[PDB]
Design an enzyme around this catalytic site. Structure first.
Site, PDB file in Angstrom:
ATOM      1  N   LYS A   1      -1.728  14.486   7.488  1.00 42.14           N
ATOM      2  CA  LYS A   1      -1.789  15.768   6.913  1.00 42.14           C
ATOM      3  C   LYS A   1      -1.994  16.045   4.861  1.00 42.14           C
ATOM      4  O   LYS A   1      -1.925  14.246   5.526  1.00 42.14           O
ATOM      5  CB  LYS A   1      -0.191  16.868   6.622  1.00 42.14           C
ATOM      6  CG  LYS A   1       0.782  16.456   7.997  1.00 42.14           C
ATOM      7  CD  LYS A   1       1.089  18.175   8.471  1.00 42.14           C
ATOM      8  CE  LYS A   1       2.064  18.422   9.272  1.00 42.14           C
ATOM      9  NZ  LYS A   1       1.386  18.130  10.703  1.00 42.14           N
ATOM     10  N   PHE A   2      -2.012  16.319   4.097  1.00 48.41           N
ATOM     11  CA  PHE A   2      -2.736  15.281   3.245  1.00 48.41           C
ATOM     12  C   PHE A   2      -1.281  15.382   2.449  1.00 48.41           C
ATOM     13  O   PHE A   2      -0.984  16.837   1.738  1.00 48.41           O
ATOM     14  CB  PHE A   2      -3.783  16.032   2.987  1.00 48.41           C
ATOM     15  CG  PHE A   2      -5.157  15.538   1.621  1.00 48.41           C
ATOM     16  CD1 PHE A   2      -5.113  14.245   2.765  1.00 48.41           C
ATOM     17  CD2 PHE A   2      -4.681  15.228   0.362  1.00 48.41           C
ATOM     18  CE1 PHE A   2      -6.656  13.809   1.821  1.00 48.41           C
ATOM     19  CE2 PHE A   2      -5.716  14.911  -0.239  1.00 48.41           C
ATOM     20  CZ  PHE A   2      -6.517  13.828  -0.068  1.00 48.41           C
TER      21      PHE A   2
ATOM     22  N   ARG B   1       1.756  14.409  -9.237  1.00 50.76           N
ATOM     23  CA  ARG B   1       2.474  13.219  -9.521  1.00 50.76           C
ATOM     24  C   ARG B   1       3.094  13.226 -10.086  1.00 50.76           C
ATOM     25  O   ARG B   1       4.437  12.096 -10.042  1.00 50.76           O
ATOM     26  CB  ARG B   1       1.457  12.649  -9.883  1.00 50.76           C
ATOM     27  CG  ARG B   1       1.695  12.635 -11.691  1.00 50.76           C
ATOM     28  CD  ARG B   1       1.706  11.284 -12.678  1.00 50.76           C
ATOM     29  NE  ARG B   1      -0.285  11.102 -12.282  1.00 50.76           N
ATOM     30  CZ  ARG B   1      -0.655   9.750 -11.599  1.00 50.76           C
ATOM     31  NH1 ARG B   1       0.369  10.069 -11.070  1.00 50.76           N
ATOM     32  NH2 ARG B   1      -1.589   9.187 -11.318  1.00 50.76           N
TER      33      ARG B   1
ATOM     34  N   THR C   1      -9.454  -0.257   4.522  1.00 49.84           N
ATOM     35  CA  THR C   1      -9.131  -1.086   2.535  1.00 49.84           C
ATOM     36  C   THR C   1      -8.256  -2.250   3.269  1.00 49.84           C
ATOM     37  O   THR C   1      -8.174  -3.292   3.331  1.00 49.84           O
ATOM     38  CB  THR C   1      -8.523  -0.803   1.482  1.00 49.84           C
ATOM     39  OG1 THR C   1      -7.405   0.985   2.533  1.00 49.84           O
ATOM     40  CG2 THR C   1      -9.574   0.466   1.200  1.00 49.84           C
TER      41      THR C   1
ATOM     42  N   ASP D   1      -3.903   4.430   5.633  1.00 55.50           N
ATOM     43  CA  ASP D   1      -4.322   5.719   6.252  1.00 55.50           C
ATOM     44  C   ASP D   1      -5.261   5.814   7.250  1.00 55.50           C
ATOM     45  O   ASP D   1      -5.170   5.345   9.068  1.00 55.50           O
ATOM     46  CB  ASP D   1      -5.159   6.445   5.308  1.00 55.50           C
ATOM     47  CG  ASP D   1      -5.690   7.605   5.655  1.00 55.50           C
ATOM     48  OD1 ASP D   1      -6.279   8.085   7.110  1.00 55.50           O
ATOM     49  OD2 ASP D   1      -6.131   8.663   4.836  1.00 55.50           O
ATOM     50  N   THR D   2      -7.035   4.819   7.319  1.00 60.12           N
ATOM     51  CA  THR D   2      -7.612   4.088   8.248  1.00 60.12           C
ATOM     52  C   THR D   2      -7.364   3.107   8.793  1.00 60.12           C
ATOM     53  O   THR D   2      -8.180   2.762   9.323  1.00 60.12           O
ATOM     54  CB  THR D   2      -9.349   4.982   7.937  1.00 60.12           C
ATOM     55  OG1 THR D   2      -9.536   4.010   6.615  1.00 60.12           O
ATOM     56  CG2 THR D   2      -9.780   5.803   7.080  1.00 60.12           C
ATOM     57  N   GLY D   3      -7.329   2.186   7.497  1.00 61.70           N
ATOM     58  CA  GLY D   3      -7.791   0.884   7.429  1.00 61.70           C
ATOM     59  C   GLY D   3      -8.799   0.060   7.085  1.00 61.70           C
ATOM     60  O   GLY D   3      -8.168  -0.910   6.422  1.00 61.70           O
TER      61      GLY D   3
ATOM     62  N   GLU E   1       0.915  -1.000   0.091  1.00 65.55           N
ATOM     63  CA  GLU E   1       0.214  -0.133   0.029  1.00 65.55           C
ATOM     64  C   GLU E   1       0.782   1.568   0.267  1.00 65.55           C
ATOM     65  O   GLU E   1       2.117   1.172   0.658  1.00 65.55           O
ATOM     66  CB  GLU E   1      -0.974   0.205   1.048  1.00 65.55           C
ATOM     67  CG  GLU E   1      -1.945  -0.783   0.825  1.00 65.55           C
ATOM     68  CD  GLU E   1      -3.094   0.420   1.307  1.00 65.55           C
ATOM     69  OE1 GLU E   1      -4.427   0.110   1.587  1.00 65.55           O
ATOM     70  OE2 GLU E   1      -2.885   1.114   1.828  1.00 65.55           O
ATOM     71  N   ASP E   2       0.444   2.335  -0.892  1.00 65.84           N
ATOM     72  CA  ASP E   2       1.452   3.788  -1.167  1.00 65.84           C
ATOM     73  C   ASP E   2       1.395   4.355   0.355  1.00 65.84           C
ATOM     74  O   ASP E   2       1.892   5.235   0.868  1.00 65.84           O
ATOM     75  CB  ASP E   2       0.665   4.230  -2.041  1.00 65.84           C
ATOM     76  CG  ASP E   2      -0.458   4.970  -2.067  1.00 65.84           C
ATOM     77  OD1 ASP E   2      -0.351   6.215  -2.206  1.00 65.84           O
ATOM     78  OD2 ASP E   2      -1.099   3.832  -3.295  1.00 65.84           O
ATOM     79  N   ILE E   3       0.480   4.001   1.043  1.00 63.82           N
ATOM     80  CA  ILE E   3      -0.023   4.953   2.507  1.00 63.82           C
ATOM     81  C   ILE E   3      -1.135   3.949   3.375  1.00 63.82           C
ATOM     82  O   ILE E   3      -2.421   3.284   2.624  1.00 63.82           O
ATOM     83  CB  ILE E   3      -0.414   6.291   1.973  1.00 63.82           C
ATOM     84  CG1 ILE E   3      -1.311   6.386   3.176  1.00 63.82           C
ATOM     85  CG2 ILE E   3      -1.519   6.262   0.637  1.00 63.82           C
ATOM     86  CD1 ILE E   3      -1.119   7.717   3.494  1.00 63.82           C
TER      87      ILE E   3
ATOM     88  N   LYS F   1       0.161   6.558   7.946  1.00 68.16           N
ATOM     89  CA  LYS F   1      -0.309   7.805   8.163  1.00 68.16           C
ATOM     90  C   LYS F   1      -0.912   7.767   9.924  1.00 68.16           C
ATOM     91  O   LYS F   1      -2.545   7.508   9.950  1.00 68.16           O
ATOM     92  CB  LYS F   1      -1.764   8.607   7.465  1.00 68.16           C
ATOM     93  CG  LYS F   1      -1.919   9.987   7.925  1.00 68.16           C
ATOM     94  CD  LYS F   1      -2.248  10.101   6.496  1.00 68.16           C
ATOM     95  CE  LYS F   1      -3.264  11.842   6.912  1.00 68.16           C
ATOM     96  NZ  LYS F   1      -3.466  11.935   5.418  1.00 68.16           N
TER      97      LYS F   1
END
Ligand SMILES: O=P(O)(O)OC[C@H]1O[C@H](OP(=O)(O)OP(=O)(O)O)[C@H](O)[C@@H]1O
Ligand SMILES: O=P(O)(O)OC[C@H]1O[C@H](OP(=O)(O)OP(=O)(O)O)[C@H](O)[C@@H]1O
Ligand SMILES: Oc1ncnc2c1N=NC2
Ligand SMILES: Oc1ncnc2c1N=NC2
Ligand SMILES: [Mg+2]
Ligand SMILES: [Mg+2]
Lengths: 214, 214
Positions: free
Chosen positions: B182-183, B196, B138, B134-136, B130-132, B162
């Site tokens: 942060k975004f 990108r 997925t 975040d919440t989980g 996963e590139d990142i 994150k």
């Protein structure tokens, strides 16, 4: 607009003038397209897919089944061309399976196995990517199938083209290294889970193939 | 281990102390992690993943929507350790989706947009990238799936974890970083088909943030 013309004769090079991996020594006969060799092509080939498609929101789409590498790089070789120059290149990725008669024996079928997601593609600038383009059999189906929906454009970049006689005569629009009817591997040219760590697109040996056969 | 972990007061670095694209100027706040810190950091993961998972066959599947790179790279180094060392680990690479959302604010949904095919990672040490994280939502789902077909072993991968109040609680098996909330954009993190062609995972400014509001 041909490509790296490679006659039915280019002797190649010895597999001991480079860093081929021992466990790929037996199964290999003669180096073909040095790894640093390919890079440069794309290193430039990306500066074409920008002289026409440049001023347009572009869409990149990749044919899978084992074609990631050549796909990545070229893309990495565009991201840069965006920043390091005045002509922008805003983009949105895409991916797709389209399967493949993934072996070695001779060619005759188009079996799809995933990646139909293209509903979006409509009304935009799209270019395809692929490793290689053998008898252009399956690709044709693809390009054929890449006639139904409807987008702004549909070029067709590819690194390896094959002067295979099976070719129905389908000229892409971006061909890195035109080559003869043979079997190569390494660097987004895999042979059933092998030659993914061989950066030098060399010709597998009539004997090597015989080690990895399915 | 979480690896290169970042606290909070982290000022990142002025985008002027690095080479970050023009247009991508005004649109960014300041720079989190340099492209480099990755080329080198990632690289390691390969040598770490390689370890635990050595002399084997691993299905390297990734999740997808917008980011392909980081994964790609994570493979490269893997590829290398085999050619630049005394080890082998045949590979397979699938391109999964569990497709995402790609936005800001409120959660609660999961609908696969392609790449659906988990009928094969059997008796095998899979590979999820996963590139990142975040919440989980997925990884959870997907992780709570591959285990079903019964693969030989499952190990995680995340360039950036994150840390957030709102988080599943999970912990990837091989983390590179563990960035705040942060975004961040750049290097295999994007914003509605933008940011990108930026090697630097910089942050989006309180301007360019609204330069492409969803
Ligand atoms: O146009 P055709 O002549 O029908 O054949 C072309 C197809 O075969 C190739 O296979 P591939 O399955 O090899 O994967 P790989 O890229 O490493 O080997 C390639 O991906 C093409 O789609
Ligand atoms: O909130 P979470 O449940 O933690 O979801 C995480 C996913 O969402 C993100 O977007 P994106 O999927 O669009 O991208 P991709 O192809 O690059 O992963 C990110 O890449 C994660 O994979
Ligand atoms: O490995 C390969 N897989 C599929 N098609 C081809 C290959 N090499 N030349 C053509
Ligand atoms: O910062 C971020 N920027 C873009 N996309 C995502 C982010 N976190 N999860 C997904
Ligand atoms: Mg193909
Ligand atoms: Mg992701």
């Amino acid at each position: 607009s041909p490509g790296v013309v490679i006659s039915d004769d280019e002797p190649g090079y010895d597999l001991d003038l480079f860093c081929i991996p021992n466990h790929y020594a037996e199964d290999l006969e003669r180096v073909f397209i040095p790894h640093g060799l390919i890079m440069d092509r794309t290193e430039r080939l990306a500066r074409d897919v920008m002289k026409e498609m440049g001023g347009h929101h572009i869409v990149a789409l990749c044919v899978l089944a084992g074609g990631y590498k050549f796909f990545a790089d070229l893309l990495d070789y565009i991201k840069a061309l965006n920043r390091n120059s005045d002509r922008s290149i805003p983009m949105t990725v895409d991916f797709i399976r389209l399967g493949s008669y993934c072996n070695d024996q001779s060619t005759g079928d188009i079996k799809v196995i995933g990646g139909d997601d293209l509903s979006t593609l409509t009304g935009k600038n799209v270019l395809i990517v692929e490793d290689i383009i053998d008898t252009g059999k399956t690709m044709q189906t693809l390009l054929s199938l890449v006639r139904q929906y409807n987008p702004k454009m549909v070029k067709v970049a590819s690194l390896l083209v094959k002067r295979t006689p099976r070719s129905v005569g389908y000229k892409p629009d971006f061909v890195g290294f035109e080559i003869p009817d043979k079997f190569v591997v390494g660097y987004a040219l895999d042979y059933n889970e092998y030659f993914r760590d061989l950066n030098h697109v060399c010709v597998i040996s009539e004997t090597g193939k015989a080690k990895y056969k399915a």
